[PDB]
A paper describes a structure:
A family of artificial proteins, named αRep, based on a natural family of helical repeat was previously designed. αRep members are efficiently expressed, folded and extremely stable proteins. A large αRep library was constructed creating proteins with a randomized interaction surface. From this library, we selected by phage display αRep binders with nanomolar dissociation constants against the GFP. The structures of two independent αRep binders in complex with the GFP target were solved by X-ray crystallography revealing two totally different binding modes.
Clear electron density was observed for residues 3–231 of the EGFP and 15–259 of the bGFP-A αRep. bGFP-A consists of 16 α-helices, which superposed well with the last 12 helices of a previously described αRep-4 structure (RMSD value of 0.367 Å for 168 atoms superimposed). In complex 1 the helices of bGFP-A are oriented perpendicularly to the barrel axis of EGFP, whereas, for complex 2, the helices of bGFP-C are parallel with the barrel axis. The majority of the direct protein contacts between bGFP-A and EGFP surface are located at the N-cap helices of the repeat protein. However, only 14 out of the 42 randomized residues are involved in the interaction. A more detailed analysis of the interfaces between the αRep proteins and EGFP revealed that different types of interactions stabilize the complexes.
Author numbering:
A (entry chain C): 15 to 259
B (entry chain A): 3 to 64, 68 to 231
The structure:
Amino acid sequence: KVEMYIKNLQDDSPPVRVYAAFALGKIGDERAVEPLIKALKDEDASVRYAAATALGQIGDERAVEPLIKALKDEDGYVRTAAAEALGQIGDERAVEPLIKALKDEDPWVRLTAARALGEIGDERAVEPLIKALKDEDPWVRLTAARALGQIGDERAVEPLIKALKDEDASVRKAAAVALGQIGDERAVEPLIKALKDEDEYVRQRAASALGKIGGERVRAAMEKLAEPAPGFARKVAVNYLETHK
Amino acid sequence: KGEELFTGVVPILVELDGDVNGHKFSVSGEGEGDATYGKLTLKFICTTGKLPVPWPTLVTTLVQCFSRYPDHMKQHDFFKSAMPEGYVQERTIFFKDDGNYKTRAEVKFEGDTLVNRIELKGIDFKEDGNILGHKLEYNYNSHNVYIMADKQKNGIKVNFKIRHNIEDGSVQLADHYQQNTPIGDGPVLLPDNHYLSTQSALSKDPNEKRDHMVLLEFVTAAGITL
């Protein structure tokens, strides 16, 4: 059957090739890596997209250079599937080519590259991702924030504190989760302020970010907040002081 | 007629009116479908402000007539066979450990345009659950949609589970139970048991400041031998 789909990858009709490629990514068998790399150059963009999608799903590092190359495809969906595929494979060789894709014309391609860079977890992405925090597109900024959170590098702490004031609630929200994930205590006071944010979800995430940071600094900020804070912020603190000792 | 209407790229319109735990909303979609590729390209906007549920929870509600049936399976394509008068699609969707949606839609040609019109009601959702607390990731999995002939009436029964990624790394399940019945008289194909295998990518439009979802979808029928 994996035999059959590999065979259908060669069919005259692009649709047949398209669903051969998808099917093979689903089955997950290594035999299909080679013929799927071939399909990455199919003249049909849907085939190229399916092939790239499947290669990400198979997880095999032999597809890494072929996919780095698909980062240059004329089709933005193909380029998107290429970046996602390289994140999923996790091979460090993808890092500098995805760093470049952070400057792609298509913001969803930029976004996907930033996601993929968080998934790899490689330190080299930290600075370019810090720059992507100032991307024009709020989806990119959000995703850059979330990727820095997952990389966990201390250099992002101050830029993320700033993002906590971004005009878009969704960036502020991802900046708060990321600060929690990094665990650096510089985030405590800024996070305490974000408990005042207008957006309820920003508020809740800044609350759990503080729970994750923990330690004496959060404890003392909460003793103080349970005295001069109001609203959600005060409940967060009284709740914290209860559960934590 | 049926499959004949689908031989090229057909334009699509989608209209949804929903009310979930009392929050009313609407969504309008526009785009196109190419059944030869089982391909959909669409953009959806919430026309009433912010969407009170996550966009991925609405993907299945928001045109299975654009699925690719392979040549040997054409006698199992109920969806296209009902056209142009179209069909009624009804679901109940159970979000595990949370509320449910019930939906009713009509899918039909209105002029040269395939149009999906839907009404959705959902209740018993948890205020800070995954749905209403917006904890779902902005992505979409690959699924198998199981289809069987409706023994009683001209129509089909359909069942599947949608897997929704949650941002903490767990998965939320949405059990779909579906029924489709034709609108018109024109007789319909009542198919052998089979399934559709789906693929979906969600994105955004960088020029769009409204709450919206861009969608690319690939679906093929499968599981009939040859």
